[PDB]
């Protein structure tokens, strides 16, 4: 059966992102989101969700983060979360950001926060 002629995961997050992108049309159809949002538009949000966790470098923390992101995808894929959840948490803020018109403030960042509130660390609602 032999002749001499016979024989002659640093990127775990990339795989998780590929899984999310490939599963995106299924959640669009399951969650009736075709008309509200486009596939590319959601594909854009998923990257920002990935980019928030860039600073970490430990492999074990990376494993935990990937498992949690897989859980987030599985919630939508398995219909644990609902259509209104998808509207509220992803599509609406992204559309709001595009529709936002703001005046480029001449005051620096310090002046604006000083005018706004005494303790900058406290959040503002309905900004």
């Amino acid at each position: 059966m032999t002749s001499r002629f016979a024989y002659v995961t640093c990127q775990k997050a990339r795989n998780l992102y590929l899984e999310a992108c490939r599963c995106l049309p299924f959640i669009h159809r399951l969650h009736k989101l075709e008309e509200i949002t486009s596939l590319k538009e959601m594909r854009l949000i998923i990257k920002d969700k990935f980019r928030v966790n860039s600073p970490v470098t430990d492999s074990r923390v990376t494993d935990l983060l990937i498992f949690k992101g897989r859980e987030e995808l599985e919630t939508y894929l398995f219909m644990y979360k609902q259509r209104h959840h998808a509207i509220t948490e992803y599509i609406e803020p992204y559309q709001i950001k595009k529709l936002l018109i703001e005046r480029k403030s001449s005051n620096s960042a310090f002046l604006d926060s000083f005018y706004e509130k005494a303790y900058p660390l406290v959040h503002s609602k309905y900004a």
């Binding site: 992102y17 590929l18 992108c21 590319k40 594909r43 854009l44």
Partner: protein, 84 residues
């Protein structure tokens, strides 16, 4: 092995490449590494491949994604494949 014209597929892929924020300005042509010439990130590369998925109705293997590196390489991959 080119199932469809090289000029057409190249124009289309570079059209989608332009859609990404960077990968433009002075050099948007062939012989441009996605991550070493265009400033693209790996996730952005995967999304670009998915956008080409929508444009040419054909899938890309993940191991091929490990193999693809350039604008020449992506157009070569899409021209080679009969479904195109």
């Amino acid at each position: 092995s080119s199932f469809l014209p090289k000029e057409e597929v190249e124009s289309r892929i570079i059209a989608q490449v332009k859609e990404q924020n960077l990968a433009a300005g002075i050099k948007v042509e062939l012989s441009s590494r996605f991550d070493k010439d265009l400033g693209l990130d790996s996730l952005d590369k995967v999304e670009l491949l998915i956008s080409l998925e929508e444009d040419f109705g054909v899938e890309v293997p993940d191991a091929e994604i490990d193999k693809i590196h350039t604008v020449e390489d992506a157009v070569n991959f899409f021209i080679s494949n009969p479904s195109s």
